[PDB]
Amino acid sequence: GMQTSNIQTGSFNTFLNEAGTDKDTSILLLHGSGPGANAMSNWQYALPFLAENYHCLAPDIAGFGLSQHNCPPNGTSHWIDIWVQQQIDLLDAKGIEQTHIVGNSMGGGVTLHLLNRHPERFKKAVLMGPVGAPFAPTEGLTKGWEFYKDPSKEALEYLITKFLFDPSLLGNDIASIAAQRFDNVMKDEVRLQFEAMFSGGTKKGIDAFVLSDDELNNISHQMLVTHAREDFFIPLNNAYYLIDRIPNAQLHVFDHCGHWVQIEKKKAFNNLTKLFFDGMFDD
């Protein structure tokens, strides 16, 4: 019920997950920036659900998973340029003129820059704990983006655990999950490019995603910003900041919830997202 492909997007190949390929309206889903992050780790629950009615495209974002960049630069601002062009190159490669879009954290930041730079290519947007607002580094985002200063199974287990408000939702054994996720995290084909993305440090990485008030004011897309009240990585105040500045943005905040809203509250998030794209919360 799901297809994968490797598709040329500019100077490198993008690993792509797709579902609902027979559907007329598409959703592009952009994952977050946990160490070892990829499309499926973020979206494996949302994809089958949304694919009942939507054509879903969920790529590994450049530098992550199986979308290694051919000449990785250093500096977050330069990776944002790459991440934006990657999605445009993907849509062009699939012959898709306009798409709905969902973005988690880093992917939500990329979403904001996509709406700013290429507004004609996008319909509705859902953000989930997005970067893009100004904030001081959190304990979570620091330990995440600077993981490779001191990498270990234990450090990765801690991160994975902190992405959820109730870690037991993950399964009965998080140590085992960290153990199996760790080998992938330590490959040079995963580590080197992650280090390059946030080489300027957490503060420079956060600041790099921030759009100006004028830019945000001029994002005209119908939008839903979702956020976990207890998000340990991106402060809830970011969501409030964004909805204060983006004209057509609604807000939804989930209680007893960690950064990974889509994993902690699978049914609620999946339904809220789908019904938003369906038009249930239109004016």
Region of 162 (left: φ > 0; alpha: ψ -120 to 50; beta: rest) is: alpha
Q: Which positions from 6 to 45 touch Cl ion by CB under 5 A, shown as an x/- string? A: --------------------------xxx--x--------
The correct pick among 23, 78, 118, 153 for binding Na ion (CB under 5 A) is: 118
Helix (H) or strand (E) holding 122: strand 122-128
Q: Which of Na ion, Cl ion, none lies near 23, with the C-beta cut-off 5 to 8 A by kind?
A: none
By CB under 5 A, the count of residues binding Na ion is: 1
Active site residue 5: no
Nearest to 83 by CA among 215, 168, 206, 209: 209
- In order of 194, 209, 265, the CA distances from 79 in angstroms are 10, 10, 30
The stretch among 115-123, 131-139, 182-190, 247-255 that binds Na ion (CB under 5 A) is 115-123
For residues 175, 181, 185, 190, the Cα torsion angle rounded to the nearest 10 degrees is -170
Is residue 116 within the footprint of Na ion (CB under 5 A)? no
Q: Which of Na ion, Cl ion, none lies near 33, with the C-beta cut-off 5 to 8 A by kind?
A: Cl ion
CB 236 within 8 A of CB 131: no
Instruction: Specify the DSSP class assigned to residue 15.
Output: E
Q: Which of Na ion, Cl ion, none lies near 211, with the C-beta cut-off 5 to 8 A by kind?
A: none
The stretch among 105-113, 169-177, 183-191, 238-246 that binds Cl ion (CB under 5 A) is 105-113
Written as six digits, the tokens of 41 are 């780790």
Q: Which of Cl ion, Na ion, none lies near 118, with the C-beta cut-off 5 to 8 A by kind?
A: Na ion
Residues identified as active-site:
105, 231, 259
